[PDB]
Design a binder for this molecule. Structure first.
Ligand code: HEM
Length: 153
């Protein structure tokens, strides 16, 4: 469980993401694909994109980044009370996309990297801690729902 303080830190930095959701979403996906190129295969959509520049020009990648962050944002704003938001996400990701928990770790690392790159002044150790805990909670809960659905990823 996070403390109220911890949630406030998460949501304060998240308000900065919300100033430019698309641009944050692009940076996060590109960082994920750069750092762990195997994930780009579990994205048949724009898995063909060959340079950083093509990635930044892709309207389809940009739109997806907004869809990912909007869903994560809605989850974080529930401060742990996220069953109704998380269940459908687990369903899709376990049964259709087949995304292992390790890939949720990879994108969590990308989120943290981009938040610190863009907002160092609102993303010091205490804020990093808090966001790390929120993303851990998300992954723990999603993994439990994966298992319920019969997916051990
Ligand atoms: C913070 C983590 C994540 C969030 C919040 C998230 C959210 C979403 C959302 C909302 C959708 C569209 C609705 C749905 O199909 O569920 C989506 C689709 C998808 N996600 Fe994720 N996702 C996350 C992580 C990942 C990772 C790490 C991968 C692959 C490495 C992945 C692969 C996909 C794919 C393949 C689709 C289908 C897209 C399409 O065909 O248009 N997701 N995700």
């Amino acid at each position: 469980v996070l403390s109220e303080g911890e949630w406030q830190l998460v949501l304060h930095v998240w308000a900065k993401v919300e100033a430019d959701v698309a641009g944050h979403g692009q940076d996060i996906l590109i960082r994920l694909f750069k750092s762990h190129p195997e994930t780009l295969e579990k994205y048949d959509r724009y898995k063909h994109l060959k340079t950083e520049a093509e990635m930044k020009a892709s309207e389809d990648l940009k739109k997806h980044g907004v869809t990912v962050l909007t869903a994560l944002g809605a989850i974080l704003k529930k401060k742990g009370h996220h069953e109704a938001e998380l269940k459908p996400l687990a369903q899709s990701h376990a049964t259709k996309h087949k995304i292992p928990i390790k890939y949720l770790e990879f994108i969590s690392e990308a989120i943290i990297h981009v938040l610190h790159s863009r907002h160092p002044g609102d993303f010091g150790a205490d804020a990093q801690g808090a966001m790390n805990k929120a993303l851990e909670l998300f992954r723990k809960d999603i993994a439990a729902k994966y298992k319920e659905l019969g997916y051990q990823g």
